[PDB]
Design a protein around this ligand. Structure first.
Ligand SMILES: *P(=O)(O)OCC(C)(C)[C@@H](O)C(=O)NCCC(=O)NCCSC(=O)CCCCCCCCCCC
Ligand SMILES: *P(=O)(O)OCC(C)(C)[C@@H](O)C(=O)NCCC(=O)NCCSC(=O)CCCCCCCCCCC
Ligand SMILES: O=C(O)CN(CCN(CC(=O)O)CC(=O)O)CC(=O)O
Ligand SMILES: O=C(O)CN(CCN(CC(=O)O)CC(=O)O)CC(=O)O
Ligand SMILES: *Cc1c(COP(=O)(O)O)cnc(C)c1O
Ligand SMILES: *Cc1c(COP(=O)(O)O)cnc(C)c1O
Lengths: 85, 126, 395, 75, 395, 126, 85, 75
């Protein structure tokens, strides 16, 4: 049987690492914040079926992040004024 | 056209053909019209005890018409003439999972059974 | 060069990456016409369209059969207003709306007045909210439709949609709401709110431009005369090819919003309070347009006295904002804003992807440039020398 | 601003005064971190020192001094 | 499992990769509203919209000011037909069209007949082509509009658009053509053809679904009453938010088609001749619907006597095709096709990406399955036994 | 708001301020109305030979109004009173490349020049 | 000065190699055929300015092919019936 | 079906009967190829033999035997 905690902590690192590669400021900052907030919000779920559902949703969203980071790199643009100062 | 149950009657055809219209033990039903897009020919062969021992069909029509008439042809075999008279359009539709826009196909297939049985009955009066 | 911050979400939103991800397969290999009934490209496109229909229905509490896809909330507003008016025109010739509705509702009503219909444009209070008792009084025996928008696109104020539904249901008058700025933002439930028709825009909820929907209640059955003639797509209510990738994007945006609404509202509320409080504690003579007690926090409309709004937008050269904007403002006039202050109002939008850093930058630049433009303003000079502007004979 | 920028990172990440970030302190047992925090803390050290910390090394970085020692040993 | 070949381009086309490439920046970072006048997101989106407008104009020989963006050719057809009829209704109440037009033109005309307008639905010859002299005779003093489509979506036959323009221009009657199946396929020039209004669909020319355009001539000025009420976008002719990514895709599809039209026509002509000739030399009783002398080669409509068309489509399980299709067929009825043969017709589409291998596979499967379905057909059995079907009393 | 030439008058302000309205050598022009979104104050200082030697302005209005009045203020300096009377709205618009929807800004700026010159002329009659 | 022939033959190889990586049969077969036909059609252009324009268009289209091949790999689907037999 | 599948590829690519694809033949001087053809021919050899032929090697493959020799020397 797979370890839910190991999947969860591996997915957390992977999703945060991949989200930091978003070229666009608003997708990058949102994805990192949202991932941090969602895993913390769901920290104390105890039902193994519900945990599994959340893990499966995270795996789906990691696929979305990977593809959309790549697409955003192929069609990138200039940085925002606040990324300078 | 899409339903696995309907397409099966085309991809895996059974009882397509003809029987001898001159036989006193053959009933032929020809129903529908080319201008309406659906023509079914159903023939039955009846033994001397009144049991339907074989049947054949040909159909011009959409996949659901081919499946409805093909299923009717399978279903009449082994039935007496009186038994086959009780096959209903609604049983054919249920078996094939026909949507409402194709229910007229199961009605025509029932009409084909009854026309074939009626033709056979006409031949027995002498 | 470096790009400005986007603080203009009531005009349009970026696509959510989850929405573009859902759309891409339909722009690459699932390109079938959802109305092609005889092959797998059609079947798969139809199935994606019907899944998206269920996603829209789930967000608003509807049955999927009540969801009709359109090209945008402009089209949905035309269908609801002209479609109901024309259907019941043999018995009913009166419609009610408000003075602060979006231009597509107002101009649809104007077109019907030229068709011989009677339209009451209700006034609003200084809060921007309608008077429910004035609405009740305006309903006539031949009133076919009341149309009142859920969230205002310029000032962000929330109309009492459930209470209006109570009024309309009890009199058997159809109730339409333009929910383009509310859908996926505040809770909407068509049965609890007693809504008969609702307009939805995909590009106001992180979905693609060029798509929308109209909810048309099926029980009790609401009848609408279709406007776009054709082969009878969308149950005869909106003929034409349903654009599979765009409706997939609309359904995905609705499902994402259903999941993110509470999180976004908490986050956007905090950023909105921060923006309003930090500007007001640092500048005198700043007024919020619209009642903060009945207001969606992501749309903030402020007036900066003695500064003209377009010059402030020019000064805020690295922030994308808008002024006297429809997603001299007729909405500001309707809430009784002095004409000069209405020339001094700016709209700030805070959305799902806005950061605290962007809010703080915008606040800091607004404070700096309002002070600069006041130091350039003859009206500020006159008030600083104790002159009452209301005593000058102008021109 | 020696490589005990490590202490600044740990204190910032875990909301702990620089005074309480002692070399002997365990993130979890002594500074109140959970394992979501320690994933983030490792990534913050990767970012600050432009270094990659793979899983078998990250699992051993459980104290302030282990963090200090790792970064000193990787330029 | 493995996917069927797409041979159904008259229903819709895949996106050209060059078109999706042009659209993507607007789905990712250039998401501004083209009507936002006060910031760079708006400026860049407006500029992309205006570039796309010029690309559409260049393909048809128009001025960009004459191009209005819409959600599709369905909407463009409604605007042209209802918009001209309603504008000149004080002086003109008669419109002319044909019996083989797309459903949006026919149903727009039906809706106007319920509004009290008179409509002549011209018949066509057995070729599918109208009789120019019958058109000339049908024009009345109060005729406001003639609408005749450039290429038919079911049978592919080309109407004499330039000659109709001559007739209409000389009588000061506005001439609209639904060019949805012709644009980027055959040459179109609005001045040489004397066109006053033209409908364009992006998804019939390797562009995205959900977008189209209408050409409205500005000199001599053609007047149209707008149908979609709102804030006055698109010169007051089509209010609502112009969907920047979709119009970028439409302009890119028009520019690519302008460059590829001659190459595609040569290639598609050769594949079309191959398909028709190889089916006809291998099967008896196959008839082409529509005159091959005035025909766009990418749309091939054949009848297979003694086989019903839907069953043939089912048999061709790995080819996506269509039957009695609008992009018992009313177009086949109008060209005088026997009702039973009209139940026996299939439409094959050949487009920019179709390969010779796909054509050969389709031909080989069609030959095999027409023979199979004839061996299952009671009508084929009867004709093989020398029975005249025209002598049977059916039902 | 967008044009580089217009924005320059805000980002790089010049001659913003006030002159002494009580001076016999100062003319003050105050034109427009707050309810119309554009109010321009233009003041000129004239030497004893009739040459405009300095000028100041304040404006409430869009960027094109600020640029039109700022440019007027620069342009009157060094001109005689009679010369400044010939500055036209069309010259201001051309210099700033104003689009037609902002041409009213160049008209108001010309009105401000003439109101300031008229005020100065009134003061010289004694 | 750059060699037009070397640019042209390098671009021809690169465009054909990249087009062969399209996951979708209809884009792959079209791109390879179209590239072969366009370079052959333009073989006998002699005007150096016109050659340069065609080279610049090819460089633009090579960028399009690279990006659209990648996007089509991220969102790929099953092969067509004829890619089997 | 020896590695003189190379001859079959050359003949197919250049529209030349197998009889005229002699070991000594230059693609250009002897078999009527232009340099668009020879780009395509090299790619066709890469495809058929699952081998990569980089530019400095492709420039030397100008005859039938040079093609044969290269493929034999690369498994
Ligand atoms: P550590 O303290 O030893 O352990 C931490 C964990 C969470 C593993 C521990 O507390 C635990 O096991 N809790 C049990 C409950 C649990 O596992 N919760 C986590 C389930 S997974 C989850 O919640 C993922 C939610 C996904 C959010 C993604 C948002 C993406 C947005 C992208 C947009 C483009
Ligand atoms: P070789 O025989 O020594 O020399 C061959 C060449 C062509 C180099 C030689 O004949 C020559 O130099 N000719 C001079 C003219 C010339 O250079 N023509 C080629 C110009 S480049 C060109 O034509 C590229 C056209 C681009 C087509 C791309 C289509 C892409 C489609 C993709 C869609 C998704
Ligand atoms: O993790 C985040 O929240 C976002 N970024 C930092 C965002 N930056 C912008 C930038 O790095 O250019 C913040 C800023 O400079 O405003 C991480 C990363 O760069 O990978
Ligand atoms: O170059 C081409 O024209 C296309 N293909 C071959 C197309 N194939 C399909 C396949 O390889 O699966 C043709 C086919 O099998 O019908 C080259 C490649 O595979 O890289
Ligand atoms: C944006 C908006 C509309 C128009 O929606 P589109 O989808 O752009 O046609 C209508 N009403 C309101 C309140 C809006 O904000
Ligand atoms: C497809 C088509 C239309 C409708 O176009 P949409 O863009 O799908 O609304 C109209 N006319 C013809 C001839 C068509 O083929």
């Amino acid at each position: 049987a797979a370890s839910s905690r190991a999947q969860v902590l591996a997915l957390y690192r992977a999703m945060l690492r991949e989200s930091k590669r978003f070229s666009a400021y608003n997708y990058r900052t949102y994805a990192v914040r949202r991932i941090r907030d969602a895993f913390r919000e769901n920290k104390n779920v105890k039902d193994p079926v519900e945990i599994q559902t959340l893990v499966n949703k995270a795996k789906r969203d990691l696929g979305v992040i990977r593809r959309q980071v790549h697409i955003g790199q192929l069609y990138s643009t200039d940085k925002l004024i606040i990324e300078n100062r | 056209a899409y339903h696995k149950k309907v397409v099966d009657h085309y991809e895996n055809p059974r009882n397509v053909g003809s029987l001898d219209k001159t036989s006193k033990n053959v009933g032929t039903g020809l129903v529908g019209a080319p201008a309406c897009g659906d023509v079914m020919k159903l023939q039955i062969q009846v033994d001397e005890k009144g049991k339907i021992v074989d049947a054949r069909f040909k159909t011009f029509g959409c996949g659901s018409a081919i499946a409805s008439s093909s299923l009717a042809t399978e279903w009449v075999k082994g039935k007496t003439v009186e038994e086959a008279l009780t096959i209903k359009n609604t049983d054919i539709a249920k078996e094939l999972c026909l949507p409402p826009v194709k229910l007229h196909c199961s009605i025509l297939a029932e009409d084909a059974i009854k026309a074939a049985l009626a033709d056979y009955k006409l031949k027995q009066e002498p | 060069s470096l790009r400005p911050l986007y603080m203009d979400v009531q005009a349009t939103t970026p696509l959510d990456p989850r929405v573009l991800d859902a759309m891409l397969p339909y722009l690459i290999n699932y390109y079938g016409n959802p109305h092609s009934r005889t092959h797998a490209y059609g079947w798969e496109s139809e199935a994606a369209m019907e899944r998206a229909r269920q996603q829209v229905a789930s967000l608003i509490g509807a049955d999927p059969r009540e969801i009709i896809f359109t090209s945008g909330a402009t089209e949905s507003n035309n269908i609801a207003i002209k479609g109901v008016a024309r259907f019941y025109r043999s018995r009913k010739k009166h419609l009610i709306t408000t003075q602060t509705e979006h231009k597509c509702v107002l101009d649809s009503c104007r077109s019907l007045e030229a068709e011989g219909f009677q339209v009451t444009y209700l006034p609003v209070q200084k809060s921007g909210i309608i008077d429910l008792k004035e609405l009740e009084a305006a309903i006539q025996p031949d009133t076919s439709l009341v149309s009142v928008m859920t969230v205002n696109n310029e000032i962000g104020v929330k109309q009492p949609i459930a209470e209006i539904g109570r009024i309309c249901s009890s009199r058997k008058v159809y109730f339409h709401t333009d929910a383009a700025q509310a859908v996926g933002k505040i809770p909407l439930d068509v049965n609890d709110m007693k809504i008969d028709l609702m307009s939805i825009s995909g590009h106001k909820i992180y979905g693609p431009k060029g798509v929308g929907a109209i909810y048309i209640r099926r029980r009790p059955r609401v009848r609408v005369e279709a406007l776009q003639s054709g082969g009878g797509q969308e149950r005869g209510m909106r003929s034409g090819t349903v654009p599979t990738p765009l409706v997939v994007g609309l359904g995905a945006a609705c499902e994402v919003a259903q999941q993110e609404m509470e999180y976004d509202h908490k986050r956007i509320s905090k950023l909105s309070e921060r923006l309003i409080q930090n500007i007001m504690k640092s500048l005198p003579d700043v007024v919020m347009n619209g009642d903060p007690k009945h207001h969606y926090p992501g749309c903030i409309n402020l007036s900066f006295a003695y500064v003209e709004g377009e010059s402030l937008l020019m000064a805020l050269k690295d922030v994308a904002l808008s002024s006297g904007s429809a997603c001299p403002s007729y909405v500001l006039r309707a809430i009784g804003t002095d004409e000069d202050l209405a020339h001094s109002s700016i709209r700030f939008g805070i959305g799902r992807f806005t950061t605290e850093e962007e809010v703080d930058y915008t606040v800091e630049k607004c404070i700096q440039h309002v002070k600069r433009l006041r130091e350039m303003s003859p009206l500020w000079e006159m008030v600083q020398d104790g002159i009452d502007l209301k005593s000058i004979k102008w021109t | 601003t020696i490589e005990e920028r490590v202490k600044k990172i740990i204190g910032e990440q875990l909301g702990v005064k620089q005074e309480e970030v002692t070399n002997n302190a365990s993130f979890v047992e002594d500074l109140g971190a959970d394992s979501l925090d320690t994933v983030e803390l490792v990534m913050a050290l990767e970012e600050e020192f432009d270094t990659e910390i793979p899983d078998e090394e990250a699992e051993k970085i459980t104290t302030v001094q282990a963090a200090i020692d790792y970064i000193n040993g990787h330029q």
